[model samples]
Every structure is written in structure tokens, then in C-alpha cells.
Target chain A: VKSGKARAHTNIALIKYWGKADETYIIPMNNSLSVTLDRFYTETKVTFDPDFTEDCLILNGNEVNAKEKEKIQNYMNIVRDLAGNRLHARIESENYVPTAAGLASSASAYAALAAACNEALSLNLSDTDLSRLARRGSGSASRSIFGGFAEWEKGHDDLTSYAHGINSNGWEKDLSMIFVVIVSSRSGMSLTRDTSRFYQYWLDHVDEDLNEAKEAVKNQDFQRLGEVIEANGLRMHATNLGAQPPFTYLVQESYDAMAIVEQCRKANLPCYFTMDAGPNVKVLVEKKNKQAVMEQFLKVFDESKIIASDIISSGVEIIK
Target chain B: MVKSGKARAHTNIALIKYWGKADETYIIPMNNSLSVTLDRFYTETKVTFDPDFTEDCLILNGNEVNAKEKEKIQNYMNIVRDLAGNRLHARIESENYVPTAAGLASSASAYAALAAACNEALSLNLSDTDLSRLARRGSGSASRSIFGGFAEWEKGHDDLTSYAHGINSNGWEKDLSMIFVVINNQVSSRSGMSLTRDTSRFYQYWLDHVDEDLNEAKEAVKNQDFQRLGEVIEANGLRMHATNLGAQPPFTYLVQESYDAMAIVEQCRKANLPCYFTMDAGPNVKVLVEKKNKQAVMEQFLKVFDESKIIASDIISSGVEIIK
Candidate 1:
């Protein structure tokens, strides 16, 4: 029996992985780019024992239910398949972030679990393999394998799909994401894909957005990057509007946050907002303009709800 | 020449929007759109053609319009003269009951009524199809306003084939009700459509699927399926507005209050009220509901909007016609 512990940072996508190409394997419909954040992460410890009767998971000191354990077990099954063993394991994970961040916690949780399992099982898997392993837990978890900026390539199959690091030449260090926690995925996505008239259009046009985001990253062009990020994010929400029932994640408060971001832009603050499948709004700004954007947000939101985060330059690593 | 005529035409809301023009000179749309004519808002026009008159003039609500405004009407009247082989200048008297330029489709009724008046005064003896075609020369939506209840504007490739015709609503439109929640407008429909066509990334995608929306909407109307019609029309209108948001220098007709009204509409739906909202190229929002739920929908909206701001109307069965 052996034990391993690891920590993985949470990442927010600049270019989101919206739809799944293959839901079974978690293959994305498009390549996505993201920046890892320092303030939010998850630490996990995994121990494999031959004498253990069953696989178990303890998340933040509370015993997970069978259904939740099954999701983890299914992911561990993939790791066990690679390690060539039937040994049961226990996973203890702790999430470190504000309760209201509403940022996807699964990204860091799964990434850390994948790394911890890789170490505990003594599986000599490469970084790409670890990324693929993390992807099985959550589609966005693939990017948490790398620090700074990462791009998840939407390969044809499970074997080919994996995320790798993108060099930003320290440009990402100057960037900050300001969070506005507004008072508030799969079935809605499936409905949009099956019913929304604009879903295919989104698929057709996403490459242009993906390429532009990458080019902006490579060239350190902040304005181009911010514009594409805002456009792509809004376009994703736009697709949701074309669904059969037509639902939008942007409530009135979300739009209010967007309006504030727009106002800041008109005032030469140079910040752009991106939203996921939630009411919360995130503003991407340079560190130099971070305070300016926060002040703008503070006008509408309280000081406790607004958070400023810098980039985390380190990926998942051994903690113990 | 001393021919005179008076006509009235009701305005309509495009359940399926007509956003951009395919042929700007001929007023052909990029895709076919469907609409439902309303009875609450309309325009009445009287045209008198006299050989003694040297030039055409417009008197709206007992007040004569300026040269620039009269020129726009003159340009439209010239098309009628060219088609009918008449060389008479006309004095136009018009009164609009609808909110002008507030996305209430006022121009649709205005132009359609104007075309009807010109047809009667000039003795053009134009069929409804020709009347619809002639009305389109002034405003694209005017073609649809030429028909009562549900109408579809076919986006024919050229000037001759593109026109509007009534879609059989099976008297279902009478059961349909709308609450007009007027807000305001920033970009006019004509300029907004042009900007979207020229710059919006999703313009082609919108064109590709709008035909499917038209067919689905037509089927819903024919089957008298209110739920299906509400779903299709709501999605179609949202898709239309989405194109503008996808433009280069993106613009949106929806203001904060528009979203607030929409939110209330959704809340109404959740409260077992079968209603859906659609927006044109302006901030005004229209909530379409069955007559059974009209009062309830209006009640939900009244919580957000003023009773004065909300005008409850229903579909009418009569289009542009000569009036006594």
C-alpha cells in the first residue's frame, strides 16, 4: 500500500469548452484556452490498499454518497485500468476557495485527484497522460494540468485529446480576473445541441475565435485577446438563446455587470467580461487596471463579493 | 384628374423578424418572415390626386410635414405613378394611432395604408398581391401588413416574385393576444439590418436557419398549436436580435428595462401562464399569449411595467382596405 498527495490550481477559460464532441469520453467540440488562478485550488490525498474492501472518498471531511463516490470510482477505474490492478482506494480531497466564488471547483478537484492517483499507483504516466486522465473527470480539468495559459486540443478521440501549456512570455502575469458573485450544465447543453438552430453555426465559427485567442496570446495583444474572449463568451450564451425553450445564464444582474464593464471600457479602463453557465460575471483586466475595474464593480456590488485574482504559474504538484 | 380615396391599415408584429434586405432597391428581404397583424394600432390615410396641384404634399394629423419628410413620401408615390402610368401629384392626409418609430411596426401600417390609398385614388385596380408588392416598395414589413391575421413575406429572389400573402391561421389568431411593452429605440431597423448584414459574424448562420424557422412557424400556425407557435416565434426573434449582438461594433435593442420585461414574461410562464415575448430592432418588447392568459400575463407585466406602458391588443382579420 502507498499514499500520495497533490495540489492542483483552478482555471477559468478565456475560450470556453462549451459542448462535447463525445460525451462518453469528454471530448470537446472545440479547443479551449484558459489561465490557471492562484487563489483557488484543491488538495487531494489517495491511498491504495490490497486489503481494502471497497473504494471510498472523503471530500472536505464529509463522507461522499454512493452516487458521488461512483463518479470518483468511475474515474479511478480509468486510473486502475492503466495501473493494471483491482486494489481499492480512498480519496480525501479539500477545496480551497471562497464559498461564493461559483467558479467551477470540479476542475481543480479532479485534476488533483488524477495527480494523486498517478502518484499513489506508481503509474509513470507522462504529463499528457495525466491531462487526459484529468479530462475524464471533467472536460475542463485537462487544462489544470498546466500552469499559466493552457490549450485543450479537441482531438478526434480519447487517445489523441489532451491539453498542453501555451507560452505567454510572462504576459499572463500582468493579467487579473475580477469576480462579481451574482446571487445565483449537461441537459441544457444537450438540449441546445439537439434543438438550438445556432449550435452548428457555433461549431462552424468557433475555430476562428479559437485561432484569434491563441494568436492574441502568442503575440501578447491584450485588446485583441479581450475582444475575442468577450465575443466568444457572448456567442456561447447566444447559442443558448436559440434553444427550444431558450434559456440564458445572463440575468438582469449579469447584464448589469456587463454594462459596468462596458462603461469601464468607454472610460479607457480596458477590461472585458466573460460568463459561464451561471449568473456570476468575471472581468478580465491587466493588473495595472485591476483596481480601476474593481472600483467600477464596487459601485454595483459590495466589497466582500468582489474578488481580485492573479495568475498561478504552477500546475498540479506533489504536496506531501 | 380628380380621383380621391381613403384607407386604413392595421400594424403588425413580426413573430418571425424581417431584419435585412436582400435587394435594397426593391425592398426584398434576405429571408421570408411571418407576422400577425394587430387591431389596437393602425393608420388611416386619404389621398387626393388633382391635375391643378403642382407638387405632392403630406399633412399628418392636420399638420403639414417638412420638405425632407414630404420627399420620402414623394419618392414612394413616384413608384406608384411609374407602375400605374399616372402623372398626377397627390395631397396625402394621414393619422397614425400607433407609437411612431417605437418598434410597434407603425411604418408597416402607414406604408400599407398609403399604398392602398394611392391604388384607389389612381384607379390602379391592383390585386391584393400587387397591393402587397407595391406596399413593400415603401417598407418591407408593409407587404405583410397588407394581409390580415397571420401573413408570411416570401423572400423571392427578385422584385416580381417577392411578396406577402395571408397564412391560414384557422381563426386561431383571434384567440392570440399581445401586450405591447414599449421602451425606446436607438438604431433604426433599416440601419441596424444593414450593419448586421455587413459586419455580424452570425449573419450567414441566421440566413441558413431562418427558412427552417419559417416552415416550423407556418406549420404551427396551420395546426393551431399555440405552444409550438409561441416557442418558434420566441426563438426566431431572439435569433434575430442575436445577430446584432454578434456584430463588429455590437449593438442591442434591448435595454435594461427590456430585459426586465422579458424576465417578467418568463416568470409569467413559470406561473402557469402560457406566454412568450419577442423583440424587434428596438427596445420595445411584445408578449404573445393566448386570450385565456392575457389578463394574467398583463398582470405579471404590470408588476414590472406601468399599466400605461402596457397596451393589450389582439390579432385582426381585416388588412388594408378602403374606408368611408
Candidate 2:
């Protein structure tokens, strides 16, 4: 019985990976940097057993639809092709996030799946190849292959593009992220690259954001890091406003949470906020400031929704 | 000798915002902008340029303003004197139907009415374009309020060229409606735009790229593309606000109530209504929607705003005109 189980934690981008430069190969439009977190993760097991009639995806103990199942199977086929096997596999994944708020959970889910498939098929893919493999499933998953600070270099082609774990002399040890999950809350080209007037400006300037964030991480500059991270997030969201039939992921609750973060920061707690394609706001802060930040958030947000997570220094690992 | 003139003008919300300034003295803008003139929220101004007056005076809402406030209006009158080549001072009486200093762009209508009233009193016989330029000296948005319906305020090289002109609505006036959900605000546009220009990191990017948005918006107006127009309007306004967030000391016009109204508008959109929101230098949020969906949109705002707080206005085809 060739079977493997693995786990991978989720990561949040400090400098976001927005529109794609190469959609077919999953190459990103910009070099995104992110930090992996310990709070939310996914555990996945891949079994390449001949007894299985066909490939199937049992996500969170529920059978997934053919369309979604096909996406995973297509991802698995890459591992099968690399391993030179025609074996049908069964993927069982358990995503351990508090809510399904589209908080880049797929990053962890796909990374764990990649590791599980690699071990079950005995593909012996290097970590870089594994990251590239994970990216084909979902772009953000590439960063989840590494822990601590990771940078997804926006390479021109598939081979050059992969996630690499960066170092900050362990300054990440003092970092934490507060996920303010707001309970209440497009056609790709038409919404983004085509219609968004700010898209090109974003593409032009994101490298500066990426470089500044990287420098802050390397120098252990919390102030610099927070400024760039928040600015980068705002810039990314600004592009959405320029889209055809413009839309926003920021609900009132999201802005409300942002105001709280600002209030805490003004009161001398160092915290900066970023958001994804959903209303959930993530606050980046030092370990010492996390309690104070969480206290401020708890006053406004429900205690259940405010999650304080520590930095994870390790990536995907085999469970069996 | 006493001379009198009176006029009325409606307010306008800048779809392509006119923020910052190239020449603060001349009241020239950093970029061109466009706006929709509304029939509601107007100002009626009466100007009496009299030789008997020792100094200029301003009566706002039936009360005389302080010297400090009158000085600003006097400076504007001085500009009117400079334009008309006259030393005669004026007493200005203004009545604003809209909420003052709440970012509903009452200044747009006020300055426009004042400029028209001055022209009438002085018998300057300035063209509408020249009146728009003169109105701009009072407030930037005042330039666009001179034209009815859609007006594009060109950010010309100097004072003479920078004035607003009406664009073809192509009959979208019948199709379009704007809902004003007045929350409130504290920052005057002058202070806000100045700080944003001087300290905001995103201001240069905004200045460089706003013309593209303005052009696209103008094209949308030309083609009578409501969705395209709405998209650009919302994006342009947000980008203008975005610059403020990136300022050295960040500021935002959107209060919690404003955000809630925006959220409700978004919810309405999700429920199959095509509605978009735009905000100025204040907390008030204006939702742009179709006349067919005006009731549906207003109902959504009623969840957050009171019935009195929500004012529905139709786009007007006439700019500033003589009251009598």
C-alpha cells in the first residue's frame, strides 16, 4: 500500500501576488513575499492504490464535485507523470481553518496535497520542484511550501519561478499575525488586467514594494516592514476599484477592524493590517504587541472571530 | 450707487475628482475632472456691489458671518473685481439648501451661484466658460457646477484655459439617478487636498494617471455607457481617497456609517441591482444607480440612514442661471 500523509500551514502575503503574468503556467504578475502562520493548516493524505476505481477528492470528509475533483486530479497527474505511473489516487484533505472566509486556505491545502502525492508516488522531487508543483495547483500554494519568510520570485517561465524560504536572522521569532475574521462578508481578464485602470501602475510599482518588504525583513526593521506591507495591501485593493463594474472585498466590518488596528498602533502597539480577496483583516505585529492588538480587536470584534497566530518556522512535513 | 444680481446653481459630485493644485494662487487643479450636476442641493446667492459699503460683507443662511469667514469670501470677490476691472466691493447673501461643510459639495453650488450673481451685478457679460473659470477661483469643484448634466473641468496650463464644459449625456440623464446618504465630515477640501498633495506618497501616481481615467470616463459619457461611466466614477473617487490614506499622516473621509451605507449599496448590487458608490472629502456616500432601481437603492440605504438623511436627486441639464 503506497500511501502518504502530510501537513502544511497557511501563509499570508506581505506583498500580495495579484494578477498573473502567465496564467497557463501559474506564474505570478509580481514577486510576492509572505510569512507562514501556525494557526491554520491542512492535513492531506494521498493513496495510490490499485483497488481504487478512479481518482477522487474527499475534502474535509465530504466528496467534492467532479469539476473540483478534476482540478486536483489534473494536479496529481503531474506527480504521476513525473513518477512514471498510471495509478489512480484518492486524496483526503482536512482543512483546519476556523472559517471558510477564502483566506488563502488553498495555499495550505494544495501544499499538503503536493507533499502527500510526492511521497505516495515516490517522485523524489526536490523542494523547489515540489514548490513549482504546488504552484500549478494554486499560485499561493507555492509559498506555503516554505515556512517563516518566503518569497515567490516572479520568474518568466515555470522552471525559474518557485517559492524560496528567506532568512531574517530569526527576527520572525518575534512576529505574530492576528486574523480578524469578519463573519458577514469577477471575470478574470474583464475585471482585472483588461478593465482595471490601475492594474498597469500596480505592475510597474509592485517590485518596489517587494524589494522594500524584503529589505525590511532582512534588516529586521519592523516599522519599515509594517509600512510597506500595509501600503502594498492598499495598493492591491486599489486596483479592484478600477475594474469594470468596480467591486471591493472590504466590508464595513473590515474597515471597522482596520480602524481598531490603527487605534492600537496609535496607542503605541506596533500593528499593521492587510487583507485578501475577502473581508477578513490580518494584523501583523511583534509577539509582544499581539496581546494588546488582540485586546483592542476583541473590544469590537467577537472573541471567537479574533484569532492570534504565531509564526511557523517550518514548511510541509510528512505525517506518515 | 448700489447694484444687485441674483442666481441659483446646483451642486455636483466629481466623478473624476479635482484634487490638489498646480497653482494654489490661481486655484488651478493638478488634474482635470468630471462631475454630474444634480437638481437637488442648490444654492441661491444675491450679490450687491455697492460703493456705499466700506468693506465686503457676507450673509450666510440669514446671518452675518465673522470677519475671518468674510475675508475668504472677500478674496473671492476681489478675484471677481480683478476679472471685471472694478474696485467696487460687494455684500453677498447666500442660502444653501444642502448641508454645509458635510462634503455634499455645497461649495460647488455656492461658488457657482456667487460667480453668476457677480456677473449679473457687474454686468461683466462673461461667457459661461469664463464664469466657470471665475467660479473655480472660489472652489475647484465650482468649475464643474457651472455646466449642467456632465461637465469636464479641464486642468489647463493656466487660469484662462482651466474651466469646465458640458459633455454629451446621450440621454443617460433619464436612465441615471444619484442617492445622497449624508453621514458627515470634518475636513475641508482645501486642507485635505493640500495635505494629500504635499505628503501622500500615492499623489504623484494619482496625478500622472488620472487623465487616463478622466478620458475613459469622458468616453463612457460620449458612448452613453452607464456601466463604464459608473465603474470609472467609483474608481476615480476611491483613488482620490486612496491618496489620502497614503499621506504622511493618513486621513479618510469614510466614517463607520459611511462604510455601512457603502456596504448596503454593495449588498443591493449583490441582490441584482447595479449600484455604485462615490464619496468626496467627507463621510457622506453617494450611490449612483438607474432610475428604475432608485427605489430599490434608496430602500437599501434606509436600513442605515434615516428617511430625511437620504435625498434622491436627478441630474440637471442646466448649470448656473439667473434667479430673477
Candidate 3:
């Protein structure tokens, strides 16, 4: 049988989720919220049949080894537990953005595959139900279920807590987020290792002020949100400073970009910035300030060094 | 008939102070901030009456020759311009704290003696104002070293610009203060030659957040506050970290003890100690909990470690020497 599904890319919060309270069940310590981007997404199709000797998997028309196959199987195990009885799942997945370039390719890819597999298996689950099932595959992938700003309300258990999109009425059109990708010639830091240590440290010493920042987000206080987020970003980096064999994603160029942004703010320019799991800098600003901010950024940085793209409104939708 | 003169101690703060500043002058990039004057200070005395000496000489106590003494003399020459005529007035002084033991003893002793010598010689006919002026000639914080308790004003200038004091009716009393003295045996990383470069980065970056924390401090003092002070202290330390990492060659000393002290705050609150901790450029902990709430800290920390001497009230007196 033929199946089709679409999944949106989810941005990982720098305020990360590290240690799992329940490793087998995948429960998180605190709630993590993310913004599912409009521009990037993934689409996948999976078919299960009784013909194959073993479960054969194909991603983007490439065959994978048993190690890669095991990752798919681990995800498929969750699908089988929920839907019951595994059939061979033939999968085809395509990324909206460049894969392995630090744009969250795996998150969207896995989320899309999960959505496809659920439909192909006739699970007939709700979006929340689908997200919980998908979360078993990748923690951040579950957040791609909704449009606009989506938060993975780090629920305590497997069933009650899952990612859902926030329903702010006018947030989509008024605010615009621009991504400035700073490509490092090297691979980015491994999130799994870094996040695990970060989470443990966070549990040992939680900054209560971070909660104030969360509350500010809930209230939509932009100035407070901006300040708290900036401080929170610094705090997140602070954990890395204390990590055993400490590692930092920041380089000198990153500092230069940060300084430039600060100088922009000092000049009364309306803009705020955030970073993901890599060296790239992303700026969030009003729709009107987009051109001016881009122009100023271009003056300081080479045109080739930056790419300007506005956030889109559409999230995940079927491609059939 | 006999007479006696009072001896006093003053602490030194770098204007282009070092927590990793690169270019000392212009205080230009890296990081920056203004600091408060603590009443807990180092005492030094300079008896510069006519003395016979084969060479321009110096002494710490009774000891005559050492490399550290020579280093001190070299550092003192910039401030000793007016004392040129009286080369025979050999400088003799003693620091209460272990020299270069990471409590900033040398900066404190050097600047304090420098201030005393200039004051006695020029008879610049100055008051505490003249003494502070003389101290600033030696070091930036030494000027404020003249006063006690909370002191700092962001007078942005090169020479004759930076100011410090004990009296300020406009600022908060409880807002700016230090607590406890956790000593470590580590010497400072930078020598006197590279002092300004070491602290320039922090000096620049510190300016960005100074206004915000200072405003918070001002309001905190108006409210007779501890909570706001605690928050500002934590934020200030974090800001200090930013300048530290932003330096040309970054250096960080945030240790497990730092985290332990922070954890203690969270744990203490849970266990009924209303205590909070703040740190400076070293690996020591300066708890910033309220004076009223300090009993909780004393009770808890004393239990885990040595109790008799771990806790002491931060002095409120200005920098002056107490000699027998």
C-alpha cells in the first residue's frame, strides 16, 4: 500500500532537555518549548508488506547498514508497540533543508517518517497521540506536529506529556525570524553527549531565574523575554564552561557577531538574536526591521557569509 | 613628651583592573565595571623620616633583600616621582595578609604605602581627599580605599577621572556589601608588568551591565534590600565571567566549590537557611545573604566545616592601619 506524510522541522531550544527521568519510557526533567519553522520540513512515505525476508529500510533512496537499521528498528519498535505487529516498512524521506548542516535535518526527517508510518499502519491516532508515538523515535521530532510557535511541554510521563503547537492568534504574521547560517568547516558538537551532561548539571544546580524567563514568555513580555532569553543563553553556555572536559560551540566569529548585534541594539535598532546547537546566529525581529537589520548585518559580514530568509506560516501538511 | 601617628590599610582595585583585560589604556574592549569599597581592608604604614642608606633601599619587616621587594620598588617608581629629592628616606612597610596569596595583598600594601609616603612628603596639604588622590596615583581602588563600606562613582576619565569614597547619600547602604573571606593559596596569574592587560577585557565588558546592576542596587538600597542585592551580585559575577571568556587569552577559575556554594543556597533555602553566595576573581565564596539571615549561613556552614573562624562580619570601617 502507498502512504504519504509531511513533517516540519523543529528548532532545538538552547535551554535543552538532557537526562531522561525514565530512560526506557523517555521522560524529561523540565518542559522544553520550541518554534517549528515555516521554511524547513521533511516528507516521508513508508509501506509494510509480508514479502521481504527481513525489514528492509531505504532513506532518500540509499540503503543503510544494520547500525542505521537498528535506529529505524528502535523507532519502529515504538510504532509496533502502539500499533501492534511489525510489517516491513519501506521508507522514503526528503529534507526541505540541507542535511548534516546543522539545520535540524534529523528532527524533521524522523518526524515525517513517524507520521508516514502511523498513517500507513492505519493507527488512526490524534495529532497529540501521533506526537507521543513519534517522540519515542526522537525527542525533538515530536514537536513538529503543529504550526507557528510549538512548545514541547516536558510532561512527566509518556502519555500525558508531548509536543504541541502554541495557538497564539496574531503571532504568526507580526513576528518574523531570520536565520544567519555560519557554516563551520567541521562537524558540530554531538548533542546527545553534550545535552546529557548539561541536563545532569542543570538538575544539580537549577537557576531559578530561568523560570522567570519562562513566565515572561507566557506573558508575551518582549523586553523581559529578550533580556531573560539573552541571560538564559549565557547561562546555558555557562554550563558548558563547567562541563567535564568542557566544550564550547562558540568561536571568535560567534563573539564578533554577538558584539555586532549588541552594537546594533545600542544604536536603537530593534532586533534580538538566539543560537541553536551550532555556530549559526538567528535574529528575531519585527517584520518592518527585517531589511534594515539584514542590510546592517551585510555591511559587517560578507554577503556570502550570510543568508537571509523570513519565517513562513505553513508548518506540516500532506504532500499528496 | 611623645607622640604617635595612626597607620591605615587600603585595598586596591584595577581601573583597567584585571580579570583578563588585554589593552590596559583607553579601557577599550574586553570588559569593564566599577567596584564598591569594602570596609575590610589591608593596613600599611610608611615611616619616611631621614634615614642613612648606601643605596635607595626598601624593607618589608626586618628582612633586607628579596626579589619581591625589588619588584615592589620597580612598581612604586611611577608614584615616587615627588619623593625623588629624598632618596635616603628608604621605604619600609608590612602587609597584614600573606604576600601574593591571592587576597590582592601586594596591590593593597603597595598602594597604601604609596599614598602614605606622598601624603607625608608633599604636605600636599590635603585632607582625606589628598590622601585618596595620592592613593589613586598608585592604584585606582586605593583612592576609594580611603573610605569604608559602600563606595564607587563611574567618573569616566584617564588620569584624575576615576573616583571612590565612603560617603554617598544618594546610593544604597545595604545594597552594596561583601560577606566572608574564603582564602586560597593560589597566586594571581598576571604579574605587575601585565596587570592592566590582564584586566582590560573585563573592564570593557563590565560597563555594559554596570548601569543595570547599579540601578538595581540603587533601588535595592532604597528598599533596604537583600534580595535585590543578591540578584545583582549573582548577575555581576556572571557579567564578570563574560569579560573573562571574552579576553584575548581566556582564563576561568569557576570550580566545583563555586557550584557547591551555589547549590548550598538552593539547598539551604530548602533546609531553612536564607543564604546566598557571590564570588569575585578567585575561587572563594562571599555569601551575600542578609545580615539578619546570616545566622542561617553561620549555623549551616559552621556545622560542615570549622565553625569558630569561618564566619566574620565584613568591616564597615574605612581603610586605616591599626598599629600597637
Candidate 4:
């Protein structure tokens, strides 16, 4: 019998994964890039007790609800097949970051589970092997096992598509992303609000420019950096407009924040703005300039409206 | 040659078009208009008020006019004498070269001239300005014809402020060449006057009498229209000021640039526009037009007064509105 304990950090996609590529393999339709956050993480411990009659699990101090137990049961089932052990295990999970936010910290959760399984089964595995296993749980978990920044290649098949740590050359600059949360609830907004509009146009036209954004990471050009991301963000919003209902995640506040960036730039300040789904806006600025950016923002909105950070987290860890 | 006010035609023919009337007796107007005191058309009228005179009398164009005819001038004198303080009757002799009934058309200029001649002879004296209100009492349009260049007669109320004032035609756009038709200038000698008793000047002697007539017939009169005609264009001028005086910040056809041009008339009394004329020279020169509008008026003239070298005006005597 064997047992293992592990911890993993959460991630946020810079270039997002909007949909699935291959459902069975859990492959992605497009490549994605993410930055890990230093502050939030999850821990799990697994015990493969040969004496157990059925698979069992505990999550964040509560008995796994049937549906929740089904996923863990399903996942551990795979781990058992690999180790050639006909045994059941009890999994205990605890989260350092608040799980009640239901922020869907799936990447970090599955990642820690995958890591713990690797140790519990005594599976001599490479990081890629660990990534593939994690990928099966949730596509984004494939990137969480590594740190700093990661890119998940939208490889066609299971063996092909796997995430690896980006070769950032440790070129950490004074960069940060400021999120102005106009909304925080899931029902507060639906990223798919533009079902009728440009959804089809977005799908059809995105390929030509998708790589354009990926290449900006290579150039390290904050100018091109802001340009492509801003453009990609705008294109994403375009789908909402293209919808018949002609909607947008961009409420007036989103535009209000964007206007501040323009005013800042016009004032000889280096500031750029972008927005993701929901009414919140994200402003990109170097750490050195983030103060100036912050001053500019203070003039536009209440301080409470701001959530600021410089997060490019490292890969997950196994805390003994 | 009597050396009197002779054959005076409303010289500013085809010049400013003052149309429509408001008050019948005081010559008030429905709309404002313009003009110049003309040399070509006028009347030689001599008025003498004496306590010994038997009754009111009016003699015009060498004929004794009717008692009914004399009533208007006599009635005008009633007010004049009232201002002058006397109950004496008056004897007036006027020679009108302006066609009898038709000459009445230049009634504006005619009354202005008679009023000037009347002021010339009195102990009972009146200023040209004072005579203006009196003249307006005689003929409504008479006020503008007393002053030169072009003048604006705002359709004012009452006889007091509802008067005409001259504009500085020389300082404005001068491209406009007031052309006359010389309609009656075919060597007609002068007439007689009494403003020994009638001190009136005859326009018979003019520069280039025949030649100026020939030269002025057709010519390019541009900037001179503005340089010479400097009255505010009603639409863009006084009317705009009128609106500005109201709430809601009104507007006119002229925008900022157009307003800048109209600002040229800022010093003018009464809200005035940039238009000038009388710019008159009989039918010969009355085709006065501002130069800025040269092309358009040239096209305009093609349709209206080309044959006016053969025109009539309030001329020859203190005559008008068909008295004799």
C-alpha cells in the first residue's frame, strides 16, 4: 500500500480556452496561455488502503457529495489501472484559497489531485506524463503543474497536446494587471451573452489573428504587447456586437476605464487597457509605472472598485 | 432759365427697392427700405406764409392746383405753422418735371426735396432733420431721399424715431457703378424758384453729362458695391441682432464668418444691414448694386432695368402725388 500528499497553485488564462476540441480526450479547440498566481493554492492527501471496500473521498472537510465523489472516483479509477492495484482509496482535500467563491479553481484542484495520485501510486512519471494525466481531468490543469507562465499547445490528440512551462527567460519586468471588477458573480454575466451576433464570425475569422497574439509574447514588445491583446480583447467583444441582440460584456464602466487609459496615454503616460468577459476591465502597466497608473485610476473610480496585482505564478509544488 | 429745381427724377431708380407701405398719412412702412437724395429728379417749391394772404394756395408745374389738392400741403403746413406759431395762410409755387400722376411714384424723394426747399425759406425755420418728420407726414418715404448715398428707414413707430439716417456709402464696397438711363437729360433747360424764398439746386449740370451717361450704361461695378453701398444686409444684420436680443440664442443665415462681415455695420444707428443705394442716377444710374453680388445682379439686371436711360423721376418742381 502507498499514500501521497501534494499541493498546487491556480492559474488564469491570458489567451483563453473558450471551448473544447475533442470531448473524450478533453483536448482544446485552441491554444491557451496563462499566468499562475502566487497567493492561491490547494492541497490534497490520498491513501490507497487495500482494506477498503469502495472508493471514498473527502473534500474541504465535507464528505464528497455523490456528484463530486463521482469525478474523484472516476479520476482515481484511472490511477488504479495504471498502478495495477485493485484497491480503493480515501482522498482528503483542503484548500488554502477560498473555494466558496466558486471561482472554478479547477486547474489547481485537479492538478493537486493528479500530483497526489502520482505519488500514491508510485508512478515514476515525467512532468509531461503528469501533465497528460492532469489534462485528462481539466484541460487547464495541464498547465498548472508547471510555473511562471505556461502555454498549452492545442495538440490534436492526447499524446500530442500537453502544456509546458514557457521559456520566459526569467525576463520578469515590472508588469502587472489591474482588474476592475464591474461584476463578480457567475450569473452576474455570461461570457456567451452574444449568442446571436458574431459568434459564428468569431469562430470563422479568429484563426488569421490568433497567432498574431501568440507571437507578441515572443517579441516582448509592450507596444505590440498592448496592441494585440487589446485587439484580441476587442475582437472578442466584437462577437457580442455581431450578435443579433447586439450585446456586449462592456457596460459603460468598462468603457469608462478604457477612456482613462486613453487619457493617460495622451497625458504622456504609458498606460494601456484591455477587458475580458464580464463588465470588469484590466489595465496593463509595468510595476514602475503602476503607481502612475493607479493615480490615474483613482481619479476615475472609487478605490474599492479596484483589485490590483502583478501575478505570474510558478508551477505547482508537492509539500511533502 | 429760371435756375430752379429742374426736372428731378428719383435719381436712385433701380437702386434700393423700398416696397410696401404701412401708414397712409405719416408714410410709415410695412418693411424698412433704403435710398439716396437724388440730383436727377426733384421739385422747386417756394412757400410763403403771410398774415395778409387770403386763403391756402398751391401752384405746381406752372398750373394752379385744386383746393382739394392744396389741402394735403396746406394740412402739412398746418402742423409746420403750429410748430412755428402762426395762423397765417401760405402761398406755394412748385414746378414738377416728374410726370404728373406717374411722377408720384418717386413720392419718397419728392416730399424730401420739397421739405428741404420749405426749410430754406422760413423765419419759421426747421432743421433738415425736423423737416424729416414733417416730410414723412407729407410722404412716408420722403425721409431717406433727404440724405445721400443710401439710408435705412426702419419701419419705426410714430413720427419721432421712425426716421431715416444716411450711411457712409463711400466707405463701403464701391464696385457698384450707379448707372442712369438719362431718360430726360436730353438738353432740357432749368426752371424757376422763389426760396430767394426757394433756394434749390438743379441737377442739370452734372459731370460727363452725356459721356458719363454712355460710360455708366454697362460696366463691371464690383467691390465698389460693398465699398460704396455699406448698409447692413437685412437678413444677416439687424435681423440677426434682433434675434440675439432674444432668448434661446437665435441665428441667421450668416455664420461666424458672415457675422464678421456684418460686424462692419456695428456703429450704425438702429439695427442696420449692409445695403446701400439711391446710388441713384435716374434710370441711368439707379441700377446700383453691391459688388460682392456683382455677378448675380448682372444676371439680375439682365431681367430688369436696361432701358432706363429713358426714365422719369420726381423732377422739375416741388411736385408729387399728382397735385397739378
On DockQ, the leading prediction is: 1
Indicate the residue-level lDDT of B72 in model 1.
Answer: 91
- Candidates in descending DockQ order: 1, 2, 3, 4
Q: Write the per-residue lDDT of candidate 1 for residues A1-320, one digit (tens) a residue.
A: 87899999988988888878788899988899999998889999999998887788998899988767888878878887888998889888899888756776878998998999889878867989999999998988999999999999999999899999988888878998988898116666766777775787678768899899899988999899999888888888788776655666666577678778878988999988888878788888999999988998888899988998898877889886
TM-score-best of 1 and 2: 2
* lDDT digits (tens) for residues A1-320 of candidate 2: 68999999999999988877786788887889999998889999988887877788888889998777887778777777777877888888898888565566779988998899888877777999999989988888999999999999889998999999997788878999999887211134335656676788788889999889888887899989999889888777767655554456676677678778778878999899998878789999999989988998888878988888998998889995
Candidate 1 chain A, run of 10 with poorest lDDT: A183-192
lDDT of 3 by residue, A221-293 (tens): 5556555455445444544543322345555456567666666677776666666556677676666776777
The TM-score obtained for chain B of candidate 2 when compared with the true chain B:
0.95
lDDT of 1 at B65: 90
TM-score of chain A for each candidate? 0.96, 0.95, 0.84, 0.78
Pitting candidate 2 against candidate 4, the one with the higher lDDT is: 2
Alpha carbon deviation, residue A15, candidate 1 (Å): 2.3
User: Distance (Å) between predicted and true CA of B61, model 3?
Assistant: 29
How far residue A197's Cα lies from its native spot in candidate 2, in Å, is 2.0
Give the true-structure RMSD of model 4: 29.5
The prediction achieving the highest TM-score against the true structure is: 2
Cα lDDT of model 1 by residue, B226-321, tens digit:
889888788788889888866655566776577677778877777799888898877788999999899988888788677778888989987888
Cα DockQ of the candidate 2 complex:
0.14
Model 2 residue B12 CA deviation (Å) reads 4.1
For model 2, what is the alpha-carbon lDDT of residue A127? 90
Leading candidate by lDDT: 1
Q: Which tens-of-lDDT digit does each residue in A175-197 have in candidate 4?
A: 67666656321211233332322
TM-scores for chain B, in order?
Answer: 0.97, 0.95, 0.74, 0.53
